[PDB]
Amino acid sequence: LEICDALARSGAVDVIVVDSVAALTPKAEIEGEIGDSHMGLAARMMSQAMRKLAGNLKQSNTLLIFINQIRMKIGV
DNA sequence: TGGTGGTGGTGGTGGTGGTGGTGGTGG
Q: How far is the CA of A6 from the C1' of B4 (A)?
């Protein structure tokens, strides 16, 4: 996301794509171990990223495309 | 401040309908 931000700020690129938001691990998770909580870090990271990108995208007139994946909820 | 992610198949029910006639013996 910081590559995306620093690229958009320059006004050079006209389209950016992120191949899946289901692959953007938080840092602490990468260096931790399997089975740890790592509760809601991804959500906080994504919210901050949007809050900080919406408007730099506008100024630079860039179009940013996300791809996602389907998961299912238990207990519904 | 900010949400995650689907498990595992179970047990059989009921019987139908009959077809065809051979061969005379003693004065």
A: 31
Footprint of strand B on the protein (CB under 7 A): A 39-44, 47-48, 71-76
Experimental determination approach used: cryo-EM
DSSP assignments along chain A, one per residue: -HHHHHHHHHT--SEEEES-GGG---HHHHHS-TT----SHHHHHHHHHHHHHTTHHHHHT-EEEE-------TT-
> CA-CA distance, A17 to A24, in Å (whole number)?
13
Angle, CA of A6, A61 and A2, to the nearest 5°:
15
